[PDB]
Write an enzyme that holds these catalytic residues in place. Sequence first.
Site, PDB file in Angstrom:
ATOM      1  N   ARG A   1      39.299 -85.386 -80.302  1.00  0.00           N
ATOM      2  CA  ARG A   1      38.499 -85.115 -81.498  1.00  0.00           C
ATOM      3  C   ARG A   1      38.819 -83.764 -82.119  1.00  0.00           C
ATOM      4  O   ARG A   1      38.742 -83.613 -83.315  1.00  0.00           O
ATOM      5  CB  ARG A   1      37.008 -85.166 -81.198  1.00  0.00           C
ATOM      6  CG  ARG A   1      36.486 -86.504 -80.827  1.00  0.00           C
ATOM      7  CD  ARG A   1      35.017 -86.359 -80.565  1.00  0.00           C
ATOM      8  NE  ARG A   1      34.409 -87.631 -80.213  1.00  0.00           N
ATOM      9  CZ  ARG A   1      33.132 -87.773 -79.890  1.00  0.00           C
ATOM     10  NH1 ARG A   1      32.347 -86.722 -79.898  1.00  0.00           N
ATOM     11  NH2 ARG A   1      32.637 -88.958 -79.569  1.00  0.00           N
TER      12      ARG A   1
ATOM     13  N   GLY B   1      42.840 -78.979 -62.390  1.00  0.00           N
ATOM     14  CA  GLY B   1      42.156 -79.086 -61.114  1.00  0.00           C
ATOM     15  C   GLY B   1      40.955 -80.004 -61.200  1.00  0.00           C
ATOM     16  O   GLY B   1      40.965 -81.093 -60.620  1.00  0.00           O
ATOM     17  N   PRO B   2      39.905 -79.565 -61.915  1.00  0.00           N
ATOM     18  CA  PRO B   2      38.715 -80.410 -62.097  1.00  0.00           C
ATOM     19  C   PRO B   2      39.035 -81.849 -62.544  1.00  0.00           C
ATOM     20  O   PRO B   2      38.351 -82.780 -62.093  1.00  0.00           O
ATOM     21  CB  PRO B   2      37.934 -79.670 -63.192  1.00  0.00           C
ATOM     22  CG  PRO B   2      38.285 -78.246 -62.993  1.00  0.00           C
ATOM     23  CD  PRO B   2      39.738 -78.241 -62.544  1.00  0.00           C
TER      24      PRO B   2
ATOM     25  N   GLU C   1      36.855 -85.340 -76.341  1.00  0.00           N
ATOM     26  CA  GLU C   1      36.636 -84.190 -77.200  1.00  0.00           C
ATOM     27  C   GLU C   1      37.955 -83.481 -77.551  1.00  0.00           C
ATOM     28  O   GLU C   1      38.107 -82.984 -78.668  1.00  0.00           O
ATOM     29  CB  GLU C   1      35.619 -83.241 -76.541  1.00  0.00           C
ATOM     30  CG  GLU C   1      34.292 -83.946 -76.144  1.00  0.00           C
ATOM     31  CD  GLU C   1      33.315 -84.134 -77.322  1.00  0.00           C
ATOM     32  OE1 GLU C   1      33.735 -83.941 -78.478  1.00  0.00           O
ATOM     33  OE2 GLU C   1      32.127 -84.489 -77.116  1.00  0.00           O
TER      34      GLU C   1
ATOM     35  N   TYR D   1      25.959 -86.584 -72.984  1.00  0.00           N
ATOM     36  CA  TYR D   1      25.923 -85.372 -72.173  1.00  0.00           C
ATOM     37  C   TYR D   1      24.551 -85.078 -71.582  1.00  0.00           C
ATOM     38  O   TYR D   1      24.439 -84.783 -70.398  1.00  0.00           O
ATOM     39  CB  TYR D   1      26.371 -84.195 -73.011  1.00  0.00           C
ATOM     40  CG  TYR D   1      27.836 -84.203 -73.320  1.00  0.00           C
ATOM     41  CD1 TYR D   1      28.758 -84.495 -72.333  1.00  0.00           C
ATOM     42  CD2 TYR D   1      28.304 -83.920 -74.598  1.00  0.00           C
ATOM     43  CE1 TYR D   1      30.102 -84.486 -72.600  1.00  0.00           C
ATOM     44  CE2 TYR D   1      29.645 -83.910 -74.869  1.00  0.00           C
ATOM     45  CZ  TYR D   1      30.540 -84.196 -73.867  1.00  0.00           C
ATOM     46  OH  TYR D   1      31.886 -84.199 -74.117  1.00  0.00           O
TER      47      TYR D   1
ATOM     48  N   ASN E   1      49.282 -93.191 -70.507  1.00  0.00           N
ATOM     49  CA  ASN E   1      49.293 -92.657 -69.145  1.00  0.00           C
ATOM     50  C   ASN E   1      49.311 -91.134 -69.099  1.00  0.00           C
ATOM     51  O   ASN E   1      49.871 -90.485 -70.002  1.00  0.00           O
ATOM     52  CB  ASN E   1      50.488 -93.229 -68.386  1.00  0.00           C
ATOM     53  CG  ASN E   1      50.442 -94.756 -68.294  1.00  0.00           C
ATOM     54  OD1 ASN E   1      49.731 -95.321 -67.456  1.00  0.00           O
ATOM     55  ND2 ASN E   1      51.182 -95.431 -69.179  1.00  0.00           N
TER      56      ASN E   1
ATOM     57  N   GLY F   1      26.069 -92.504 -71.523  1.00  0.00           N
ATOM     58  CA  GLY F   1      27.140 -91.582 -71.207  1.00  0.00           C
ATOM     59  C   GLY F   1      27.027 -90.335 -72.069  1.00  0.00           C
ATOM     60  O   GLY F   1      27.969 -89.547 -72.194  1.00  0.00           O
TER      61      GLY F   1
ATOM     62  N   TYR G   1      34.760 -92.147 -77.803  1.00  0.00           N
ATOM     63  CA  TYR G   1      34.003 -91.839 -76.605  1.00  0.00           C
ATOM     64  C   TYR G   1      34.268 -92.882 -75.494  1.00  0.00           C
ATOM     65  O   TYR G   1      34.633 -94.026 -75.771  1.00  0.00           O
ATOM     66  CB  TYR G   1      32.509 -91.789 -76.951  1.00  0.00           C
ATOM     67  CG  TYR G   1      31.712 -90.756 -76.180  1.00  0.00           C
ATOM     68  CD1 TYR G   1      31.373 -90.944 -74.848  1.00  0.00           C
ATOM     69  CD2 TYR G   1      31.294 -89.587 -76.799  1.00  0.00           C
ATOM     70  CE1 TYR G   1      30.642 -89.999 -74.162  1.00  0.00           C
ATOM     71  CE2 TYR G   1      30.572 -88.639 -76.122  1.00  0.00           C
ATOM     72  CZ  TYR G   1      30.245 -88.846 -74.807  1.00  0.00           C
ATOM     73  OH  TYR G   1      29.513 -87.882 -74.153  1.00  0.00           O
TER      74      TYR G   1
END
Lengths: 202, 259, 208
Positions: free
Chosen positions: B176, B138-139, B173, B119, B6, B117, B76
């Site tokens: 990763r 934010g994003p 990422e 990029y 979570n 999916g 991924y």
Amino acid sequence: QQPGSELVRPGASVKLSCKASGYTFTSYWINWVKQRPGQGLEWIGNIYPGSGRTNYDEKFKNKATLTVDTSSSTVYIQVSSLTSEDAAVFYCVRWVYGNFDSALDYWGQGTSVTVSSASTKGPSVFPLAPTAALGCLVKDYFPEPVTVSWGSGASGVHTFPAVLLYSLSSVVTVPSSSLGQTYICNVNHKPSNTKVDKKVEP
Amino acid sequence: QYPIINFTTAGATVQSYTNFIRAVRGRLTTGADVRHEIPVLPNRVGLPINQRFILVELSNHAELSVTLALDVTNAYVVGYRAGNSAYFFHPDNQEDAEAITHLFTDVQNRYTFAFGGNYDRLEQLAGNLRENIELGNGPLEEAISALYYYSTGGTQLPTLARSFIICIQMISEAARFQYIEGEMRTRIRYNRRSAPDPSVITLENSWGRLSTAIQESNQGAFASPIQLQRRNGSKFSVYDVSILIPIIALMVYRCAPPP
Amino acid sequence: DIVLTQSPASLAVSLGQRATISYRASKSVSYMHWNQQKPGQPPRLLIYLGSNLESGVGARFSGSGSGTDFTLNIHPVEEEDAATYYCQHKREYPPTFGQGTKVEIKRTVAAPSVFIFPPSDEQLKSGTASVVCLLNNFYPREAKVQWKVGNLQGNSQESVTEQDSKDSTYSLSSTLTLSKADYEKHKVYACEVTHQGLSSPVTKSFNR
């Protein structure tokens, strides 16, 4: 491509084959589906030959082992300790998950698995005699099938499905004015190299 | 059932986030497979389906919650669930296509996008590129909401694809790379929000082949060097795995460990 | 697991009528498969992705539905369409099949011919005694057979044919196999038959 029939004794085990031709053998899933006589379709499990991954229905988790012979382009399903409830037909199936080639489903001929301790017994052919129905009672044979004709023929005939050794009936009916003409039932049991042609007389 | 990890954007701190990424790394790999001090993700081959995915549940200040699905083999995203609906990136093959039928097995609605999916396609469907799409708490907050509302017609495709790009970079990422995890760490401390610089973009694009070069290397030395980029966009080659130890944190399985 | 309950089990339909088969799901299905199967044949996909017709399928065939309710419709039933239809889903693991729906050609109700046969000399010269009763060319499929040896009943042997490809009828073959030394301890042997066609049961019998 699968064999059509397998005999297997009670508590023994069977190793069913499925040779795959005509597509990338390591790019699709091969499924196993079990059909018992006159009942529905149960999915037993599957395998992805290209990566070796398997799935088994909980109802078969400890009865079945799927494995693949990449060399032969073949899949195997092995069932354990066969009961009478295990006597059934075993289809193998290529089907696609997804969308791009959705209608790709393709079924093997299936494999009728009988579970029996019996031996190739000959059959006894008994006449059934009284607009008039006649008959043969083919009693106590093994294995299946027998094949009954009346020369022929041909119409008004009801050759019934065998019941349990095996035993079937066969009715022919004919105009009553024809009791002076010979009606003979022709049984053949291919496995006992036996052929019986019993005249039905009163 | 698959493990869940979570994370809220609500009140997120550097520690709240770091914990999440370290928790994600923990359930992605056992850490028994380590080459040159860099862990390896499980080999796709021979892996039980019940260990194929982990689940990441993101919540936000708006009291909305989505659950993303990660492939342990790749780290991924393969799809997500939001309420009664699960959406999945188009699988490249029939093994993957079957694997996702084991996910969110209890949802009423399952759909599969026509698009992958990667990029490349997502940037196209979004209208922006990775270097134009800001990343930050934010994003991320906004990505969680967009994904949630896509089920109910309230989210348009370009915004959906863009929200993916936000999630994939801040979760996949970041797991990763320890570098990318840091770049998100800075954005949370100084409360920033910004597109990734060329140092980040270069790593994401190179993760698969860094993974290959490290694993097929000679005692650490690359067969051919690998070109990356600095923040200022300047190019430089990497010749050995030593410079990467504080940078790459997970590799995809490429080959068995050599003697 | 997702369980697919099909309805009805049996469906009767005169050629030309309109047939609709349902499939109730215990949870929601997104896209729903349909297979057709005929006695002695492996099932064939008839409908994929809920509504898209398979190759070769006649166009009277239509599939629809959503959530927990999917359906298969035939607008005017041709006869070749008599078979058993299974719905299928493979998108939420594990894959499942439907309970099955067998559609039979409907036709004029017909009483069965009942014909009873005592054991042959050949059987009874082997300590066996089987009394066969043929029940031919009736409709609908359901029948009831009682055996009356003086009275009583017992342990018999019934097999049933497929719906005829010419006159859409069914047949039953009931055999009663007793031993000679048991067969010759009573005298009256009756094959009584209950059915729709009549309220009063067709009776055939003989004496030893």
